[PDB]
Amino acid sequence: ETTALVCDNGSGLVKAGFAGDDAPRAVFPSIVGRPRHQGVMVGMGQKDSYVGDEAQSKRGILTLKYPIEHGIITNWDDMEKIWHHTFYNELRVAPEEHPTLLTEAPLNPKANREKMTQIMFETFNVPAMYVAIQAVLSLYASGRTTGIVLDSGDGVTHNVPIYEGYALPHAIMRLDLAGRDLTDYLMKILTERGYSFVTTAEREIVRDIKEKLCYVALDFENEMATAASSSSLEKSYELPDGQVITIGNERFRCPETLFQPSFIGMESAGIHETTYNSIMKCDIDIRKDLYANNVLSGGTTMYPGIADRMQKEITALAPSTMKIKIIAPPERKYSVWIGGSILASLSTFQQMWISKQEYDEAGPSIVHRKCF
Amino acid sequence: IQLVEEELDRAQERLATALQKLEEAEKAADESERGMKVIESRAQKDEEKMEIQEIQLKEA
Amino acid sequence: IQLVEEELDRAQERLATALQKLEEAEKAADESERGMKVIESRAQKDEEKMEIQEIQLKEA
């Protein structure tokens, strides 16, 4: 059978590999570096485009750009570079031999779904392809046809009620606030403590810090009080040039913005609130199988202690005769990619692919007839 | 010479050993997580069954 | 001397980096282990309670 490349379009990490395997085989940063100055390398070759880990090692001399900003492809040129690198550098295979599965947000722009369909088929010459909602794949990785997924990426958070494998198009909710924003916010609040960070390279350390040291508090006022009353809510981090910095209440404050969007000046409601409001758009006999399967997904959900917080919050908004229970997969950061690996290796799914012939007949439009 | 050489060599012996130990620590983390995955999936299946039973019992 | 010294210095830097990554993998392993232990304790409790209910359900 044809080996399908599953490529998760994560906004701060690419996750890529082959279908039928239990885990991604390449996990690298979504970063394209291009030179700030030319002349840097003399006696050695210069290139102008570095991608992923190659770019990461050269960060000092590169201008980093993100291909995907807030789950939205913002530059077609940087999306292409990521792709060129995925196939030829990272997996070292011809894409033209391998069908492609691409991941997307709910309500991912149609003009974008098309430019993605077109770019894959004309330049890479893919034999077949498909595009699928991130949360639907994470639900298949959770072994379920039906449930509501809180998917919080490295850039967007969605609440996605799904039923018999279809995401409910009137009931889904979105929040632009997650891992990308979270770094920029963390950096702000550290400047406020007097650990000013103004350089973007230092920003990436702040990113790493965030992933390692942030934790979801179970009670925001009680932990805040604890940090005000004692310095036991602080963890040290040694910067790689030396210099020991102390990260305080910023640890739980940073992700606190997910529950209270007003802290960054939004009119948006919180991730627990949009969970509750999303299920309340659904019919009562499916509210049962939706509430019974509240699933966490994506990189932002890997902060410890999140389940007890989300269990709390949802039981407080929701009536005490729906079964409330948080499902947190063992490696929830990958559950989109794992769900794509499952879906692309089902014998029933092989009828669904966009073929090169259907693209030649209808142009990039074909995704809006084959994908749902 | 000899001291700088002996110090290097042991430093490499030590590095080699630290990489071996890193792979071992990595393996063990994987064995723990897998086990952790198996218990977790058994806990969850029992829970879903339990809640259906608390309800079946209330319903009955 | 110098060449050997430059090789030793490189060897030392590599050893430090491996030891930090190793300490991290140990910590992550310790954490999987903790995670696992709470999960096992829940698993037991959900099972007993699902079983306890199986008796009560039969009775109703």
Side-chain angles (χ1 to χ4, degrees):
Chain A
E1 295 185 331
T2 52
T3 316
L5 299 185
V6 182
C7 300
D8 189 19
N9 296 318
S11 297
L13 303 160
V14 179
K15 309 192 190 78
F18 307 91
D21 290 355
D22 295 334
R25 287 297 179 244
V27 184
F28 56 100
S30 313
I31 55 184
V32 178
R34 318 195 178 180
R36 296 187 183 260
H37 294 317
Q38 296 202 46
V40 160
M41 320 194 180
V42 171
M44 295 196 283
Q46 292 184 59
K47 310 167 184 165
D48 281 358
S49 66
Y50 299 105
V51 186
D53 310 327
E54 196 167 62
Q56 185 46 70
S57 33
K58 289 190 181 181
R59 185 170 211 311
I61 61 159
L62 299 167
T63 316
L64 305 191
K65 305 179 192 201
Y66 305 104
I68 300 146
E69 302 197 45
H70 301 249
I72 292 290
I73 297 76
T74 48
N75 191 12
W76 309 110
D77 298 349
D78 282 346
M79 196 67 254
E80 293 164 82
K81 278 179 164 58
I82 292 259
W83 291 322
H84 183 239
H85 164 86
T86 294
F87 310 130
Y88 297 127
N89 297 257
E90 294 291 85
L91 297 180
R92 302 207 182 73
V93 296
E96 66 173 285
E97 289 183 57
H98 311 313
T100 53
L101 174 61
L102 302 184
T103 69
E104 65 168 6
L107 312 178
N108 174 39
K110 302 169 292 185
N112 301 28
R113 284 172 161 170
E114 289 176 74
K115 189 59 166 184
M116 284 201 275
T117 300
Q118 178 189 146
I119 298 172
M120 289 278 61
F121 270 119
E122 296 191 299
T123 296
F124 301 102
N125 307 295
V126 295
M129 71 176 287
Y130 206 80
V131 191
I133 290 175
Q134 287 160 205
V136 174
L137 305 184
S138 291
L139 192 75
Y140 298 155
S142 81
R144 286 161 166 78
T145 77
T146 299
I148 183 167
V149 184
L150 188 166
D151 186 41
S152 190
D154 292 326
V156 64
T157 304
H158 298 92
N159 287 301
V160 195
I162 295 149
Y163 172 52
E164 312 309 353
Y166 291 88
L168 298 176
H170 69 293
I172 297 152
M173 296 291 287
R174 178 173 179 144
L175 173 69
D176 287 347
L177 177 49
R180 188 38 64 208
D181 302 47
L182 274 180
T183 306
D184 309 354
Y185 176 71
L186 172 50
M187 191 187 175
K188 189 180 55 52
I189 62 177
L190 276 155
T191 308
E192 297 170 54
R193 192 189 184 81
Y195 300 139
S196 176
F197 289 107
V198 182
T199 306
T200 54
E202 303 197 76
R203 180 195 163 190
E204 285 281 357
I205 318 189
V206 194
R207 195 168 171 71
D208 185 25
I209 284 161
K210 175 212 66 143
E211 289 168 55
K212 292 176 159 161
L213 286 191
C214 301
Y215 74 100
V216 187
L218 165 60
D219 187 21
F220 175 64
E221 289 295 345
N222 193 61
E223 277 75 91
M224 285 295 280
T226 299
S229 52
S230 185
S231 56
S232 76
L233 287 191
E234 307 203 54
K235 294 282 152 177
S236 282
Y237 183 72
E238 166 140 37
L239 301 174
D241 67 85
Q243 150 186 61
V244 176
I245 57 182
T246 304
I247 311 293
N249 59 350
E250 294 56 49
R251 293 176 46 217
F252 49 114
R253 296 166 57 179
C254 158
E256 191 53 31
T257 48
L258 289 164
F259 301 110
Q260 304 186 249
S262 55
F263 285 4
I264 63 155
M266 295 172 90
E267 319 208 321
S268 285
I271 60 167
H272 61 302
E273 307 178 61
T274 52
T275 301
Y276 173 70
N277 291 349
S278 179
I279 306 163
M280 293 294 288
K281 292 289 187 177
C282 307
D283 302 337
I284 297 170
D285 293 333
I286 71 169
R287 290 181 194 174
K288 184 288 205 182
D289 291 327
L290 292 168
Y291 270 111
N293 297 322
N294 275 267
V295 178
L296 296 178
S297 171
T300 283
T301 70
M302 297 295 298
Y303 306 133
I306 187 167
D308 305 345
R309 181 59 186 282
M310 292 301 304
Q311 171 50 46
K312 163 192 170 196
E313 283 297 307
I314 293 169
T315 306
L317 309 192
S320 71
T321 269
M322 272 289 162
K323 172 201 171 202
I324 314 306
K325 177 172 174 182
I326 300 315
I327 297 173
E331 52 209 294
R332 46 200 181 286
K333 50 166 165 177
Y334 302 144
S335 292
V336 182
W337 185 94
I338 294 172
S341 181
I342 292 160
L343 182 65
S345 63
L346 302 186
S347 59
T348 55
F349 181 73
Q350 307 308 316
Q351 284 64 230
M352 301 298 293
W353 301 109
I354 301 155
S355 70
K356 192 182 293 178
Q357 177 172 352
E358 292 157 300
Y359 174 82
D360 288 342
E361 278 151 2
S365 332
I366 185 61
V367 65
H368 302 132
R369 296 92 179 277
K370 304 292 290 201
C371 304
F372 309 105
Chain B
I1 51 156
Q2 319 184 259
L3 284 67
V4 198
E5 289 173 328
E6 294 183 272
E7 285 190 298
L8 149 71
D9 296 325
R10 299 165 161 76
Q12 288 179 115
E13 295 166 75
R14 288 177 297 163
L15 171 49
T17 272
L19 296 183
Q20 185 167 212
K21 283 179 67 182
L22 190 61
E23 157 173 74
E24 292 174 333
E26 285 172 322
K27 263 194 304 188
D30 307 328
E31 286 148 64
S32 180
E33 176 176 357
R34 291 171 193 120
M36 194 165 77
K37 288 168 49 169
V38 163
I39 302 177
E40 163 181 64
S41 187
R42 289 151 196 258
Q44 286 176 1
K45 283 178 179 183
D46 307 339
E47 179 175 353
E48 313 337 328
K49 206 175 165 167
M50 164 177 68
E51 290 282 352
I52 288 168
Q53 285 198 96
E54 277 201 289
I55 295 165
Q56 285 174 299
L57 187 59
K58 283 176 311 177
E59 284 177 308
Chain C
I1 283 192
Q2 302 178 9
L3 284 177
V4 184
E5 271 194 270
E6 284 175 51
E7 292 183 294
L8 164 58
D9 303 342
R10 292 169 198 163
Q12 291 170 149
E13 286 168 326
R14 271 168 179 74
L15 173 85
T17 305
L19 299 168
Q20 158 189 119
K21 287 176 174 180
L22 172 49
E23 159 178 72
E24 291 190 52
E26 292 176 354
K27 289 158 178 158
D30 297 320
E31 294 153 76
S32 177
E33 163 157 271
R34 306 166 188 119
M36 190 178 55
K37 290 167 147 182
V38 190
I39 295 165
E40 157 264 308
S41 186
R42 291 184 310 110
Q44 296 169 190
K45 296 155 171 168
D46 307 350
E47 186 200 69
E48 284 176 54
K49 186 159 151 166
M50 170 194 101
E51 292 174 270
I52 285 145
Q53 265 144 234
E54 287 181 271
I55 313 189
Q56 293 161 343
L57 177 79
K58 269 24 175 67
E59 296 169 45

